[PDB]
RNA sequence: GUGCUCGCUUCGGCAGCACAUAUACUAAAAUUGGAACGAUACAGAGAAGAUUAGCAUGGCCCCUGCGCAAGGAUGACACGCAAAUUCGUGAAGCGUU
């Protein structure tokens, strides 16, 4: 029923107060894996995976850098077990990059002209009020 | 969005600055045509009597094979009243200058 752990040592100290929500996020991810595509476009059906992955990683990130509610050990346990993304966090700690979607949406090898997605353009520099949905992600304006 | 402003100056708002700067064969489609054996009837395997191994050759014919191997009926086709330049003799009869 839960995620099979791969550490086999017991989880660290403050585990028991973050587990209902981690399992609730984990139950939410298993919904999105099994949704049948019908009226969902070919790229659109993968958008919930990136959203929930953002959410799980944001949750551990808030409990350790904002709320200071978790030690290094419980933090690095959640990264090793796959609850949080190590690389997505390392971009959120950068200066401009603090509500980033994905690592796809800043990867310049993934685009034709070698650039970020329009996801990453500040909404004030589009100056028109056009509506954006990133094809990688579904995002409407990180930056 | 975040941070810094000995910014107004409260913790409400605003101002300034810094970082952050252009995805997508753009459809979950509408269309548009050419196509699956294989069944339907027909159809029957070259070499001058008959029964037959085959190896080629040529290209707006392909199939199987990774093949510059080898197979596919010798893989099939090829079977054509197969006419390409350029004429003269001799007498004989009839009409004519
Ligand atoms: Mg042969
Ligand atoms: Mg034979
Ligand atoms: Mg032959
Ligand atoms: Zn994204
Ligand atoms: Zn994006
Ligand atoms: Zn985004």
Hey, is A55 helix, strand or coil? helix
Q: A29 C-alpha to center of ligand 4: Å?
A: 17
Which residues make Cβ contacts (< 8 Å) with residue A29, sequence separation at least 6? A49, A52, A53, A56
Helices (H), chain A: 19-33, 47-61, 72-80, 86-92
Domain ranges for chain A = 1-143
Closest nucleotide (C1' vs CA) to A115 is B22
Length of chain A: 143
The gap between A18 CA and B86 C1' (Å) is 112
For this PDB entry, the determination method is cryo-EM
End-to-end CA distance of chain A: 38
Hey, is A28 helix, strand or coil? helix
The gap between A37 CA and B35 C1' (Å) is 29
DSSP states of A90-119 as a string?
HHHTSSS-TT---SSTT-TTSSSSS---GG
Cα A134 to Cα A75: distance, rounded to the nearest angstrom: 30
Cα A74 to Cα A32: distance, rounded to the nearest angstrom: 27
């Amino acid at each position: 029923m839960p995620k099979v752990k791969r550490s086999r040592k017991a989880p660290p100290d403050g585990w028991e107060l973050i587990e209902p929500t981690l399992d609730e996020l984990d139950q939410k991810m298993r919904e999105a894996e099994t949704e049948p595509h019908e009226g969902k476009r070919k790229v659109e059906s993968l958008w919930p995976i990136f959203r929930i992955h953002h959410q799980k990683t944001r949750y551990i990130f808030d409990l350790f850098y904002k709320r200071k509610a978790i030690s290094r050990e419980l933090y690095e346990y959640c990264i090793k077990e796959g609850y949080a993304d190590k690389n997505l966090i390392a971009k959120w700690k950068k200066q401009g990059y603090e509500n980033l979607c994905c690592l796809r949406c800043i990867q310049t090898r993934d685009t034709n002209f070698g650039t970020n997605c329009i996801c990453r353009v500040p909404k004030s520099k589009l100056e028109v009020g056009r509506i954006i949905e990133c094809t990688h992600c579904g995002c409407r304006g990180c930056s």
